[PDB]
């Protein structure tokens, strides 16, 4: 399986937040559909605010 994450906000997450989320995501796929760790294809994309709807009023 593949999981794409699109995040945009004042403050991009540090490495700690991404580590936490990575491991929760693997464990969830493993528990719910049996996906071995780490066969999950994870892709987090940090989108700059000027590249979202928010560009209208920054």
């Amino acid at each position: 399986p593949m999981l794409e994450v699109f995040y945009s906000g004042d403050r991009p997450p540090d490495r700690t937040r991404k580590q936490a989320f990575a491991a929760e995501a693997s464990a969830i796929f493993q528990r719910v559909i049996g996906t071995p760790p780490g066969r999950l294809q994870l892709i987090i994309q940090i989108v700059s605010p000027e590249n979202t709807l928010a560009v209208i009023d920054l």
Binding site: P1, M2, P13, K18, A20, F21, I28, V47, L53
Partner: protein, 61 residues
Amino acid sequence: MLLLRITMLEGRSTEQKAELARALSAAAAAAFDVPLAEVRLIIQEVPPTHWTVGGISMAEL
């Protein structure tokens, strides 16, 4: 914004798809500090013939 997109092999139960949407959304809300209410998640399914590894489809087994 916080949006998740899963791409996965079809064949799983509606209870499984729902539990992934629910568990992953809560995990992303907590990890990235966004209100749960703002989290979108799209699920996209694919036939075994349309998912390949090392050049060969999953229907190859």
